[PDB]
Coordinates of C-alpha atoms in Angstrom, one line a residue:
Chain A
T344 CA 145.2 48.7 103.9
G345 CA 141.9 48.8 105.8
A346 CA 140.7 50.7 108.9
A347 CA 137.2 49.2 109.1
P348 CA 136.7 46.0 107.0
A349 CA 133.1 45.8 108.2
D350 CA 132.3 48.7 105.8
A351 CA 130.9 47.2 102.5
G352 CA 130.4 50.4 100.4
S353 CA 132.5 51.6 97.5
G354 CA 131.4 55.0 96.3
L355 CA 132.5 58.4 97.4
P356 CA 130.8 57.9 100.8
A357 CA 132.9 54.8 101.6
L358 CA 136.0 56.6 100.4
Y359 CA 134.9 59.5 102.6
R360 CA 134.6 57.3 105.6
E361 CA 138.0 55.8 105.0
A362 CA 139.5 59.3 104.7
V363 CA 138.1 60.3 108.1
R364 CA 139.1 57.0 109.7
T365 CA 142.7 57.5 108.6
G366 CA 143.1 61.3 109.3
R367 CA 143.1 62.4 105.7
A368 CA 140.2 64.9 105.6
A369 CA 142.4 67.4 103.7
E370 CA 143.4 64.9 101.0
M371 CA 139.7 64.0 100.7
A372 CA 138.4 67.5 100.5
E373 CA 140.8 68.1 97.5
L374 CA 139.4 64.8 96.0
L375 CA 135.9 66.1 96.4
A376 CA 136.8 69.5 95.0
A377 CA 138.4 67.9 91.9
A378 CA 135.4 65.6 91.5
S379 CA 132.9 68.6 91.4
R380 CA 134.6 69.6 88.2
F381 CA 132.6 66.8 86.5
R382 CA 129.1 67.9 87.9
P383 CA 126.9 69.9 85.5
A384 CA 126.8 73.5 86.7
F385 CA 124.5 76.4 86.1
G386 CA 125.6 79.8 84.9
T387 CA 124.2 83.3 84.9
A388 CA 122.3 82.8 81.6
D389 CA 120.4 79.8 82.7
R390 CA 120.2 80.2 86.5
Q391 CA 118.4 77.5 88.3
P392 CA 115.8 78.9 90.7
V393 CA 116.2 79.3 94.4
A394 CA 113.4 79.3 97.0
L395 CA 113.9 80.6 100.5
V396 CA 112.5 78.4 103.2
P397 CA 110.3 80.1 105.9
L398 CA 111.6 79.6 109.4
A399 CA 109.6 81.7 111.9
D400 CA 107.6 84.8 112.5
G401 CA 109.6 96.1 114.3
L402 CA 112.7 94.1 113.5
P403 CA 114.1 93.4 110.0
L404 CA 113.9 90.1 108.2
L405 CA 116.6 87.7 109.4
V406 CA 118.0 85.4 106.7
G407 CA 120.2 82.4 107.5
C408 CA 122.5 81.3 104.7
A409 CA 122.9 77.5 104.8
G410 CA 126.4 76.1 105.2
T411 CA 128.3 74.0 102.7
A412 CA 128.8 70.9 104.6
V413 CA 127.1 67.6 104.0
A414 CA 125.0 68.2 107.1
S415 CA 123.9 71.6 105.9
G416 CA 120.6 73.0 104.7
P417 CA 117.8 74.9 106.3
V418 CA 117.5 72.4 109.1
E419 CA 120.7 73.7 110.7
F420 CA 118.9 76.9 111.9
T421 CA 115.8 75.2 113.3
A422 CA 117.0 75.3 117.0
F423 CA 118.0 79.0 116.6
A424 CA 114.7 79.7 114.9
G425 CA 112.7 77.9 117.5
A426 CA 114.5 79.8 120.3
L427 CA 114.0 83.0 118.3
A428 CA 110.2 82.4 118.0
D429 CA 109.2 82.4 121.7
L430 CA 111.0 85.8 122.2
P431 CA 108.9 89.0 122.5
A432 CA 108.8 91.1 119.3
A433 CA 111.1 88.7 117.5
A434 CA 112.1 89.1 113.9
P435 CA 110.7 86.9 111.1
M436 CA 113.2 84.5 109.8
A437 CA 114.0 82.8 106.5
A438 CA 116.7 80.5 105.1
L439 CA 118.8 80.8 101.9
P440 CA 119.8 77.3 100.7
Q441 CA 122.9 76.7 98.7
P442 CA 121.8 74.9 95.5
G443 CA 123.1 71.5 94.4
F444 CA 123.1 69.4 97.6
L445 CA 119.6 68.1 96.7
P446 CA 118.7 65.9 93.7
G447 CA 119.2 66.7 91.0
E448 CA 120.2 70.3 91.3
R449 CA 123.2 71.8 89.5
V450 CA 125.9 73.5 91.4
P451 CA 126.8 77.0 90.3
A452 CA 129.4 77.3 87.7
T453 CA 130.6 80.7 89.2
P454 CA 130.0 82.7 92.4
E455 CA 128.2 85.4 90.3
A456 CA 125.7 82.8 89.0
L457 CA 125.1 81.7 92.6
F458 CA 124.6 85.1 94.1
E459 CA 122.6 86.5 91.3
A460 CA 120.2 83.5 91.9
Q461 CA 120.2 83.9 95.7
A462 CA 119.8 87.7 95.4
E463 CA 116.7 87.5 93.3
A464 CA 115.0 85.0 95.6
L465 CA 116.0 87.2 98.6
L466 CA 114.7 90.5 97.2
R467 CA 111.5 88.8 96.1
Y468 CA 111.0 87.3 99.5
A469 CA 111.8 90.5 101.4
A470 CA 109.9 93.0 99.4
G471 CA 111.0 96.5 100.6
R472 CA 111.7 95.2 104.1
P473 CA 115.2 95.6 105.4
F474 CA 117.0 92.4 106.0
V475 CA 120.0 91.1 108.0
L476 CA 122.0 88.2 106.8
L477 CA 123.4 85.5 109.1
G478 CA 125.5 82.4 108.7
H479 CA 127.5 79.8 110.7
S480 CA 130.8 78.0 110.0
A481 CA 131.0 77.9 106.2
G482 CA 127.6 79.5 105.9
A483 CA 129.3 82.5 107.5
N484 CA 131.7 82.7 104.5
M485 CA 128.7 82.3 102.2
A486 CA 126.8 85.2 103.8
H487 CA 129.7 87.6 103.7
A488 CA 130.1 86.9 100.0
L489 CA 126.5 87.4 99.2
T490 CA 126.8 90.6 101.2
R491 CA 129.8 91.7 99.0
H492 CA 127.6 91.0 95.9
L493 CA 124.6 92.9 97.2
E494 CA 126.6 95.9 98.3
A495 CA 128.6 95.9 95.0
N496 CA 125.3 96.1 93.1
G497 CA 124.0 99.1 95.1
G498 CA 121.9 97.1 97.6
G499 CA 122.8 95.4 100.8
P500 CA 121.7 94.0 104.2
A501 CA 121.2 96.2 107.3
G502 CA 123.8 94.1 109.2
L503 CA 125.8 90.9 108.9
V504 CA 126.0 88.2 111.6
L505 CA 129.0 85.9 111.2
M506 CA 129.1 83.0 113.6
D507 CA 132.6 81.4 114.0
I508 CA 134.1 82.3 110.6
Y509 CA 137.5 81.1 109.4
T510 CA 139.4 81.4 106.1
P511 CA 139.2 78.1 104.1
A512 CA 142.5 78.9 102.2
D513 CA 144.1 79.9 105.6
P514 CA 142.2 77.6 107.9
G515 CA 144.1 78.3 111.2
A516 CA 142.7 75.9 113.8
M517 CA 140.0 74.6 111.4
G518 CA 142.7 72.9 109.3
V519 CA 144.2 71.3 112.4
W520 CA 140.6 70.2 113.3
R521 CA 139.6 69.4 109.7
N522 CA 139.4 65.7 110.3
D523 CA 137.4 66.4 113.5
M524 CA 134.9 68.4 111.4
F525 CA 134.5 65.7 108.7
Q526 CA 133.7 63.3 111.6
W527 CA 130.9 65.5 113.0
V528 CA 129.2 66.6 109.7
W529 CA 128.7 62.9 108.7
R530 CA 127.2 61.7 112.0
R531 CA 125.0 64.8 112.3
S532 CA 123.2 64.2 108.9
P533 CA 125.3 61.4 102.9
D534 CA 125.5 60.3 99.2
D535 CA 127.7 61.1 96.2
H536 CA 125.4 64.1 95.3
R537 CA 125.7 65.9 98.7
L538 CA 129.5 65.1 98.8
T539 CA 130.3 66.6 95.4
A540 CA 128.2 69.7 96.3
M541 CA 130.5 70.1 99.3
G542 CA 133.4 69.7 97.0
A543 CA 132.2 72.4 94.6
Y544 CA 131.6 74.9 97.4
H545 CA 135.0 74.1 98.8
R546 CA 136.4 75.1 95.5
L547 CA 134.4 78.3 95.6
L548 CA 135.7 79.1 99.1
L549 CA 139.3 78.7 98.2
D550 CA 139.0 82.0 96.3
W551 CA 137.3 83.6 99.4
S552 CA 139.1 86.4 101.3
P553 CA 138.2 88.2 104.5
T554 CA 137.4 91.5 102.9
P555 CA 135.4 94.4 104.4
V556 CA 131.7 95.1 104.1
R557 CA 129.6 98.3 104.7
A558 CA 127.0 96.4 106.8
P559 CA 127.7 96.4 110.5
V560 CA 129.0 93.1 111.5
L561 CA 128.1 91.0 114.6
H562 CA 130.8 88.3 115.2
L563 CA 129.8 85.4 117.4
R564 CA 132.5 83.0 118.4
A565 CA 132.4 79.8 120.4
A566 CA 133.6 79.6 124.0
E567 CA 135.1 76.1 123.8
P568 CA 137.5 74.7 121.2
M569 CA 136.0 72.0 119.1
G570 CA 139.2 70.0 119.1
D571 CA 142.3 70.0 121.2
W572 CA 144.8 72.9 121.0
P573 CA 148.3 71.9 122.1
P574 CA 149.4 75.6 122.4
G575 CA 146.9 76.1 125.2
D576 CA 145.8 79.6 124.3
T577 CA 142.7 81.0 122.5
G578 CA 144.7 81.3 119.3
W579 CA 142.2 78.9 117.7
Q580 CA 139.5 81.5 117.9
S581 CA 137.5 83.0 115.0
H582 CA 138.4 86.6 114.4
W583 CA 136.9 89.6 112.6
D584 CA 138.7 93.0 112.9
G585 CA 136.3 95.9 112.8
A586 CA 133.3 94.0 113.9
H587 CA 130.6 96.2 115.4
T588 CA 130.1 93.7 118.3
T589 CA 132.0 90.5 119.2
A590 CA 130.2 88.1 121.4
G591 CA 131.1 84.8 123.0
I592 CA 128.5 81.9 122.8
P593 CA 128.8 78.9 125.1
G594 CA 129.6 75.6 123.4
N595 CA 132.0 74.8 120.6
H596 CA 132.1 75.4 116.9
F597 CA 129.0 73.3 116.5
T598 CA 127.2 73.1 119.8
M599 CA 127.0 76.9 119.8
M600 CA 124.3 76.4 117.2
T601 CA 122.4 73.5 118.7
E602 CA 122.6 73.0 122.5
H603 CA 123.3 76.8 122.9
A604 CA 121.5 78.3 120.0
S605 CA 119.2 79.8 122.7
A606 CA 121.9 82.2 123.7
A607 CA 122.8 83.2 120.2
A608 CA 119.1 83.9 119.5
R609 CA 119.0 86.2 122.5
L610 CA 122.2 88.2 121.7
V611 CA 121.2 88.5 118.0
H612 CA 117.8 89.8 119.3
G613 CA 119.4 92.4 121.5
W614 CA 121.6 93.6 118.6
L615 CA 118.9 94.1 115.9
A616 CA 117.4 97.6 115.2
Chain B
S579 CA 125.0 59.5 90.8
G580 CA 128.5 58.6 92.0
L581 CA 131.8 58.0 90.2
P582 CA 130.0 56.1 87.4
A583 CA 128.0 59.2 86.6
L584 CA 131.0 61.5 86.8
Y585 CA 133.0 59.2 84.6
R586 CA 130.4 59.4 81.9
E587 CA 130.3 63.2 82.1
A588 CA 134.1 63.3 81.7
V589 CA 133.9 61.1 78.6
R590 CA 130.9 63.0 77.2
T591 CA 133.0 66.2 77.5
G592 CA 136.3 64.9 76.2
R593 CA 138.1 65.0 79.6
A594 CA 139.1 61.3 80.1
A595 CA 142.5 62.7 81.0
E596 CA 141.3 64.4 84.2
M597 CA 139.0 61.4 85.0
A598 CA 142.0 59.1 85.0
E599 CA 143.8 61.6 87.3
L600 CA 140.7 61.7 89.6
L601 CA 140.4 57.9 89.9
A602 CA 144.1 57.7 90.6
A603 CA 143.6 60.1 93.5
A604 CA 140.3 58.5 94.6
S605 CA 142.0 55.1 94.7
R606 CA 144.6 56.2 97.2
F607 CA 141.8 55.7 99.7
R608 CA 141.2 52.0 98.7
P609 CA 142.2 49.4 101.3
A610 CA 145.3 47.7 100.0
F611 CA 147.2 44.5 100.6
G612 CA 150.9 44.4 101.3
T613 CA 153.3 41.5 101.0
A614 CA 152.6 40.7 104.7
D615 CA 148.8 40.4 104.4
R616 CA 148.7 39.0 100.9
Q617 CA 145.3 38.6 99.1
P618 CA 145.2 35.2 97.4
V619 CA 145.2 35.1 93.6
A620 CA 143.7 32.2 91.6
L621 CA 144.2 31.3 87.9
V622 CA 141.2 30.9 85.7
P623 CA 141.5 27.9 83.3
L624 CA 140.4 28.8 79.7
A625 CA 141.6 26.1 77.3
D626 CA 142.7 22.6 78.1
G627 CA 146.0 21.0 76.8
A628 CA 145.4 19.6 73.3
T629 CA 153.1 18.4 72.8
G630 CA 155.4 19.8 74.1
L631 CA 154.0 23.3 74.2
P632 CA 154.2 25.7 77.2
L633 CA 151.1 26.9 79.1
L634 CA 149.8 30.3 77.9
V635 CA 148.9 32.6 80.7
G636 CA 147.1 35.8 79.6
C637 CA 147.4 38.7 82.1
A638 CA 144.3 40.6 82.6
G639 CA 144.4 44.3 81.8
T640 CA 143.5 47.3 84.0
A641 CA 140.3 48.9 82.6
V642 CA 136.7 48.4 83.8
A643 CA 135.8 45.5 81.4
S644 CA 139.1 43.7 81.7
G645 CA 139.8 40.3 83.2
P646 CA 139.6 36.6 82.1
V647 CA 136.5 37.4 79.9
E648 CA 138.7 39.5 77.6
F649 CA 140.3 36.2 76.5
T650 CA 137.1 34.4 75.3
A651 CA 137.5 35.2 71.6
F652 CA 141.2 34.4 71.7
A653 CA 140.9 31.2 73.7
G654 CA 138.1 29.8 71.6
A655 CA 140.2 30.2 68.4
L656 CA 143.1 28.7 70.3
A657 CA 141.3 25.5 71.4
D658 CA 140.3 24.5 67.8
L659 CA 143.8 24.9 66.3
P660 CA 145.4 21.5 66.0
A661 CA 147.7 20.4 68.8
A662 CA 147.0 23.5 70.9
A663 CA 148.9 24.6 74.0
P664 CA 146.8 25.0 77.1
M665 CA 145.8 28.4 78.4
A666 CA 144.7 30.2 81.7
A667 CA 144.0 33.8 82.6
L668 CA 145.5 35.6 85.5
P669 CA 143.2 38.3 87.0
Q670 CA 144.3 41.6 88.6
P671 CA 143.2 41.8 92.2
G672 CA 140.9 44.7 93.2
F673 CA 138.2 44.6 90.5
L674 CA 135.7 42.2 92.1
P675 CA 133.5 42.9 95.2
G676 CA 135.2 42.6 98.5
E677 CA 138.6 42.6 96.9
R678 CA 141.4 44.9 97.9
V679 CA 144.0 46.6 95.6
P680 CA 147.7 45.8 95.7
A681 CA 149.6 48.2 98.0
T682 CA 152.8 47.9 95.9
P683 CA 154.0 46.3 92.7
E684 CA 156.0 43.9 94.9
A685 CA 152.8 42.8 96.7
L686 CA 150.8 42.1 93.5
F687 CA 153.6 40.2 91.8
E688 CA 154.5 38.0 94.7
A689 CA 150.8 37.0 94.9
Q690 CA 150.6 36.4 91.1
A691 CA 153.9 34.6 90.9
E692 CA 152.9 32.3 93.7
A693 CA 149.6 31.4 92.0
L694 CA 151.1 31.1 88.5
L695 CA 153.9 28.8 89.7
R696 CA 151.4 26.6 91.7
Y697 CA 149.1 26.2 88.7
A698 CA 152.0 25.4 86.3
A699 CA 153.2 22.4 88.3
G700 CA 156.6 22.4 86.5
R701 CA 155.3 23.3 83.0
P702 CA 157.1 26.2 81.2
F703 CA 154.8 29.1 80.5
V704 CA 154.3 32.1 78.3
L705 CA 152.9 35.4 79.6
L706 CA 150.5 37.3 77.3
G707 CA 149.0 40.7 77.6
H708 CA 146.9 43.1 75.6
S709 CA 146.8 46.9 76.1
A710 CA 147.6 47.7 79.8
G711 CA 147.6 43.9 80.3
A712 CA 150.8 43.9 78.1
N713 CA 152.4 46.3 80.7
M714 CA 151.3 43.9 83.4
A715 CA 152.6 40.8 81.7
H716 CA 155.8 42.6 81.1
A717 CA 156.0 43.8 84.8
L718 CA 155.5 40.3 86.0
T719 CA 158.1 38.9 83.7
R720 CA 160.6 41.4 85.1
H721 CA 159.6 40.4 88.6
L722 CA 160.0 36.7 88.0
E723 CA 163.3 37.0 86.1
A724 CA 164.6 39.3 88.9
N725 CA 163.9 36.5 91.5
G726 CA 165.4 33.6 89.6
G727 CA 162.8 32.4 87.1
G728 CA 160.6 33.8 84.3
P729 CA 158.6 32.8 81.3
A730 CA 159.9 31.1 78.2
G731 CA 158.2 33.8 76.3
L732 CA 156.2 37.1 76.4
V733 CA 153.5 38.2 74.1
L734 CA 153.0 42.1 74.1
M735 CA 149.9 43.2 72.2
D736 CA 149.6 46.9 71.3
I737 CA 151.7 47.9 74.4
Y738 CA 152.2 51.6 75.0
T739 CA 154.1 53.5 77.7
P740 CA 151.5 55.0 80.2
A741 CA 153.5 58.0 81.3
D742 CA 154.4 58.8 77.6
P743 CA 151.6 57.0 75.7
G744 CA 151.8 58.9 72.4
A745 CA 148.8 57.8 70.4
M746 CA 147.1 56.4 73.5
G747 CA 147.4 59.8 74.9
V748 CA 145.5 61.2 71.9
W749 CA 142.8 58.4 72.0
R750 CA 142.4 58.1 75.8
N751 CA 138.8 59.3 75.5
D752 CA 137.9 56.8 72.8
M753 CA 139.4 54.2 75.0
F754 CA 137.3 55.2 78.0
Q755 CA 134.1 55.3 75.8
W756 CA 134.7 51.8 74.4
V757 CA 135.6 50.2 77.7
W758 CA 132.3 51.4 79.1
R759 CA 130.1 49.9 76.3
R760 CA 132.0 46.7 76.3
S761 CA 131.1 46.2 80.1
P762 CA 128.1 48.1 83.8
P763 CA 130.9 49.9 85.6
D764 CA 130.5 50.5 89.3
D765 CA 132.5 52.6 91.8
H766 CA 134.5 49.6 92.7
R767 CA 135.7 48.9 89.2
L768 CA 136.4 52.6 88.5
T769 CA 138.5 52.9 91.7
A770 CA 140.4 49.7 90.8
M771 CA 141.2 51.1 87.4
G772 CA 142.5 54.1 89.2
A773 CA 144.7 52.1 91.5
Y774 CA 146.3 50.4 88.4
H775 CA 146.7 53.7 86.6
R776 CA 148.8 55.0 89.5
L777 CA 151.2 52.0 89.3
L778 CA 151.2 52.0 85.5
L779 CA 152.2 55.6 85.4
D780 CA 155.6 54.7 86.9
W781 CA 156.1 51.8 84.4
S782 CA 158.9 52.0 81.9
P783 CA 159.6 49.6 79.0
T784 CA 162.8 48.0 80.3
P785 CA 164.2 45.0 78.5
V786 CA 163.4 41.4 79.5
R787 CA 165.3 38.2 78.9
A788 CA 162.5 36.1 77.4
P789 CA 161.8 36.4 73.7
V790 CA 159.1 38.9 72.9
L791 CA 156.4 38.3 70.4
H792 CA 155.1 41.8 69.6
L793 CA 151.6 41.9 68.0
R794 CA 150.2 45.2 66.9
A795 CA 147.1 46.7 65.4
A796 CA 146.7 47.2 61.7
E797 CA 144.2 50.0 62.1
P798 CA 144.2 53.3 64.0
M799 CA 141.5 53.0 66.6
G800 CA 140.8 56.7 66.6
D801 CA 141.6 59.2 63.9
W802 CA 145.2 60.1 63.2
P803 CA 145.5 63.4 61.3
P804 CA 149.4 63.2 60.9
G805 CA 148.6 60.5 58.3
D806 CA 151.7 58.4 59.2
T807 CA 152.4 55.4 61.3
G808 CA 153.3 57.3 64.5
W809 CA 150.2 55.9 66.1
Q810 CA 151.5 52.3 66.2
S811 CA 152.7 50.3 69.2
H812 CA 156.5 50.0 69.2
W813 CA 158.8 47.3 70.7
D814 CA 162.5 47.5 69.7
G815 CA 164.3 44.2 70.1
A816 CA 161.3 41.9 69.8
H817 CA 161.9 38.4 68.5
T818 CA 159.0 38.8 66.1
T819 CA 156.8 41.7 65.1
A820 CA 153.4 40.9 63.5
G821 CA 150.6 43.1 62.5
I822 CA 147.1 41.8 63.4
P823 CA 143.9 42.7 61.6
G824 CA 141.7 45.4 63.1
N825 CA 142.3 48.2 65.7
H826 CA 143.4 48.2 69.3
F827 CA 140.2 46.6 70.4
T828 CA 138.9 44.4 67.6
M829 CA 142.3 42.8 67.2
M830 CA 141.3 40.7 70.1
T831 CA 137.6 40.6 69.2
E832 CA 136.8 39.9 65.6
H833 CA 140.4 39.0 64.7
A834 CA 141.4 37.0 67.8
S835 CA 141.8 33.9 65.6
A836 CA 144.4 35.8 63.7
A837 CA 146.3 36.6 66.8
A838 CA 146.0 33.0 68.0
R839 CA 147.2 31.3 64.8
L840 CA 150.2 33.6 64.9
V841 CA 151.0 33.0 68.6
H842 CA 150.5 29.3 68.1
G843 CA 153.1 29.1 65.3
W844 CA 155.6 31.3 67.1
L845 CA 155.4 29.0 70.2
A846 CA 156.1 25.9 68.2

């Protein structure tokens, strides 16, 4: 019936805005996931290329896998990389993008086509150097899956850093806060292209499950809830059984990797090698 | 790219079925008008009174190139038949910029009924629809008759049942392809189409009191392997049932004068 008549758009962005204004992020995410079925997609035979984006320069290569939100891309690491740079003996860093958010890239048809494409960029960028993968929010899901694929094919990273991971199919607090997230990722920045990419990766991440990896895991989790939590406990918190190290980072699900990315850089640094 | 570019990919790949489902879903985020906050509807005059014939009111259909322009071929023929009845078109709210969609069937039809009865100024009228517009002319006849009025007639052209469309199920993709070329569809027309798909999927072919002139296409728009007449529009209990030259679309393009000579004679 109309939450903000002043808005004069009509595409998916306007429909997106009207979803978040009326508390229907879940309904909208499904819409976007169904929409991505009509985006051309690349498969393993004709993989579109992927280029890692340099981020900074005894430690292994650090590789940040971009998230799958509209706000996501290499940019999301730049505070972390900048804080990482001015550290003594700091690792060199790169960034793995998720293809399709930029024009006019295809999304993957399958996870195998994605990880085959990201894995060839990765090994070409790293040479024989050991690497450690990292990712935050949905980028944490994306980095664990790439890990699965690397290890399954006889390779792998030296360790896996997973900042504030949740299960998309079992969202816990991240479902309760879904509309709150959709709010943030817009303002942080969104066209139809980026929005259907988010839809396609959301479809990918409905088949995701919290399965083990060989690589030692570092699990960073925010100190503050991003939304409100009526139960009043820390039941909202990200979890990872069998993590080598679990470490709290000040800030919330997002501000841990902006206003407080300095502390994450320091703890990552003290954990490597 | 947007919903225009997804729509064409769906049609290019034979998936107009999923595209109608998507737009139905996408439309549930369109701002809507209820009966309380009604969006005004205005009739579009097409042909002047040339009696004592009733006013013909075509009901606009629900696809992306529907509206009062779909009655230009028909209304031109009508205006050069001798002693013609006048005619106006009734648009469907939500397809033009800045317009909202109807929240409920009740909201749309109270808006339309208001407008239509204003414009008539006492004159009896005949509701006329083609394709999904037939379902809308029917659904408004039901609404009016339920509330103590109604048209003196109803003209259903090539009406199918959306939930169980038979041949229009088979040909949905040819439908979508043609309605695009006829147009240039934007997000706002695709999302309106979707809103009207949602309401039409609940539509059933209930009987009406007014006499029904049923007009149907001679030719199968798409191919029909069965080789029989199971592709044709079907209205049991119609007053009159006439075949009109052409297929679902050209029956109101090239052969509109055929439809209009026939309507004209049926009315008088």
